[model samples]
Target: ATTLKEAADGAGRDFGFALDPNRLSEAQYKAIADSEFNLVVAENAMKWDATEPSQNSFSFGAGDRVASYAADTGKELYGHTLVWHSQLPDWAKNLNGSAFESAMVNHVTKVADHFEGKVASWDVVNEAFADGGGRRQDSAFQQKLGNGYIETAFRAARAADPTAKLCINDYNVEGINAKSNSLYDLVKDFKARGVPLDCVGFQSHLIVGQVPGDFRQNLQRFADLGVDVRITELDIRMRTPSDATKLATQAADYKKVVQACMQVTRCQGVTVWGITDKYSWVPDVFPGEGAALVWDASYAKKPAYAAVMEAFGA
Candidate 1:
């Protein structure tokens, strides 16, 4: 029980990392992934664009590869998303009214059916809320189908695969802020109305020293509402040439996240955005802000790795 996976198992949780199927060829990547994580999520393989690039035509090559890896290694699989505003193909985005609604239900049901027994959960709808408050009017489904589309996707997924957990994932909602408050209303409403929503995902894509101090409180509130909470897509990013002080701060932040999850009864687990800093989306998306994962570019463990293991009682 020396590894994080072993420790997570001991603590009764599923610790996970985002998997890019293409990187499995790298020996260190695949080996560590198989050994360290109990849950596997397709980084972009299951997103709307990858799954249904063109009208009604589906693709499963990359998603299947990730699923295969998880199955072969005896790891649980999580579906990245079924409906997302970003990464949605043009056809799905261009439709309106019943056309848009039909595409949404059909796509959700088929995708969930395809991976029915395999996935532990599916991000049924992603980032439907705006950064400040209110629904993101720009969301394709929200634009055409309105806020009800969130519940629509959830029911479709449950009807398709009753066993798989359904979640609505979003960033900037890890703490009880304006954005999280809106998500709170949705989760609360869904629970009371029996919307088939089973979980809520706090993307947890944070900065090195900016973790919310009341993170556990926020998670606990959501858990009390009768839904599981997961720290999905976690990565505390800092500047490059990463100094010891910033790395230390990152370790403390990672530990805080693990501790918060552990303290809450319905918190399922935590999942890092990527396996290594080299592949972290921070650098490419925000230049000069890199080094956002537990494993270094060479697959060597970092201080945050030790902090997470320690948080799990390693």
Candidate 2:
């Protein structure tokens, strides 16, 4: 079978998986990652909780492992994120007013600088939009610095790593809706004002049989805004106790998603949320729903894998 990296390379795109360095010990995980993916994203290692567990004390141990692996293996490194509402430490979360903004800039600069030439792109600002519409009120950054925090984080990211492509990533944006529309407006304004934003990421976290009919159009709309578009975190989860029928439908869904990206001229690449269902966050986050990834828990390739490869024309 043609590897995912081979298919992506053929199509002149990057294909990758979100990896947890802690799972490097698994032989199959390492094998598939090294051979099949040309890009690597540190699952939770690059998140706020893991990188900066305590105030101003940034740790790169887990992130470094993935970065080094990417470098040594000749794979492209994509920083999972620099700023997000969730997984933040107490110290940073509690800060208010200018203090919060200062810390936000400082963290973005320090983290982006540390990664420098190693990481090609970063989710500088993630999930800033609420599910219904507008900026997320729950985000401490938005709550403290207002909507300006997103631009502030992107600007700091660009300054820190001038060459890195900075992106604003969020879920529930795979198709047209209130949530995606809100983010689209922000990105439109950022472009007109020269905000240094380079890309927009649609975290295509979808349910089985629910792939939006206008998924490709949504991506095209963002690309027309003069920013690269990418499916940052993709996974299709179904109700538990999956059977052959459900698996076949999932294969079709996977193909549709890949083909949608392929049709979008400016769509840079695709990255599944996790390598295997064993490590997928679906089950925990959505009770009794999983089998979301291309690979099964035992590292066996599922039917969806073939469908994706076929979609890539491998």
Candidate 3:
């Protein structure tokens, strides 16, 4: 059975999907989830709002479901995030100064603590950099806890789970550009200062036929900094009403992405944002851009699936 997981494992890598536990009840979804991938990241179950919606009172019902599945299936469990700007509850977001700092510490600490032996890594802080360059001024972490908020969160995650690989995740950073440049600086500085940063996640939310040319080079550069790089949230969207050409292009694009990961020694894995386009988050965000996954709505493998298998040398 040369499944996606088998193929990726054969190549000494991982192939995974960010999935919702609720969707696992479907027989098709469960079958693929059980066999096709070797890694699992909760779509929203591990996020701040869902895990710790009310201050110190933490919740892990949703996250535990994902962890349980991964453990039972013998898959590597990865945590989505310990700190992020979006999907944050008003209680934590609305605070500032030391109060916000405490929330940041406790959030990562408690959340990471709960998933101690389950997850192998976590996105300690997500999307803290703005487009073009510099810290995202809009982020409360930056404004409230200042520029060191990222380090603060990363350190807390380390304290909570000493052996887990801690990562910082963001969008539009697959290639070396202004945003990625700033990330490069941050990773460099973190290494210089002995920060507990282990990986840099490039959220490859891309368009068909538009995978950045410097994708491989950029991942290598970050890997050179001694931190693993990964295609964290991959989905190549196309103009709605996809045709043969677009699907082919998407398939090629998917192959290029997986190949880049395969080529980079420190590039651990590629986790498609979702299992199938039926539950993809693209169309809702980018009106006409849809069908951004390896599987279609009917659980039939798309052209991209075979491309991915080929890329993984299945």
Candidate 4:
């Protein structure tokens, strides 16, 4: 049987996903590390709040452990995020005046400097765009820096390390939502201005029975704009532990997502948020929801996983 790594590797670009990195045992982690997957998406390991919880103090011990594992095993890593509006420290949230920018720049430079060449990509400035065509007025970054914060962030990331691919990632986007279309327009605008974006990551957090109808065409549209694409945090969610029909629709949605990736050259890879449904972050965070992955709680491949792998021609 072809391993997931084997199946993904045969596709000729890369296969990866964001993982807690702490959940897997040394052996289990090594199993994925040693597989045919060229890319290994590292999660929360490199987030700003995790690496630098305090203003004057920074830590990478936890992140370093995971990065070391990947490096030792020859797996490529993507440092998830730097300037997201969420998950920031309280210190950062309440930071007075212009001090926050310094703190933000300091954290980004430190993390980038630490990983330097280790991470292959970064969600440099995540989810900063508003849905449709307005600016994110409620975002603290925007509240402080106005609309120019994003460009400043890109400059900071590039200056820290020009090697890693920088990305702008977001969710609530699968097919042609007005939000996604707005984001696409912005990407094109950035490209017209020669912004240094290397990719656009679509957080494919899907609900059951409703995969975006034009998923493939949407990605192709983005790809046509001369930027790479990735299914950054993919999962097919359900209302609860799903019934038979719900489960089947979930499977079909998952396959459709993978099929989109297969059709777009710039569609780089796919990464489910977590490996198994039980540990997935969606339900706990969203409430009254669970069952959002291609693996059961026991790590057995569910129909969705089989379907995606099959779609990839395994």
How do all models score by TM-score? 0.98, 0.98, 0.98, 0.93
Which residue pairs in model 4 clash with each other?
Answer: 17-271
Between prediction 2 and prediction 4, the one with superior TM-score is 2
Name model 1 segments beyond 4 Å from true. none
Candidate 3: residue pairs that collide: none
Summarize candidate 4's per-residue lDDT along 182-211 as a digit string, tens digits: 788778988889877878999888888878
Please write out the lDDT profile of model 2 over residues 1-314, one tens digit for every residue. Answer: 37888998898888889988888899889999998889999888888888887778899899999899899899999998999999899999888998888888888988899899999999999999988888887888878888678888888899899899999999998889999999999999999999999999998999989999999999999999999999889999999878998899999999999999999999988899988999999999999999999999988988998888888878
TM-score of candidate 4 versus the correct structure, residues matched by position = 0.93
Better of 2 and 4 by lDDT: 2
lDDT score of residue 15 within candidate 2: 88
Q: Looking at candidate 1, what is the lDDT of residue 7?
A: 90
Residue 202 in model 2: lDDT: 91
Give the CA lDDT, 0 to 100, for residue 273 in model 2: 91
Judged by lDDT against the true structure, how good is candidate 4?
0.78
Least accurate stretch of 10 residues (summed lDDT) in model 3?
Answer: 137-146
Query: Which structure is stronger by lDDT: 3 or 4?
Result: 3
lDDT-sorted candidate list, best first: 1, 3, 2, 4
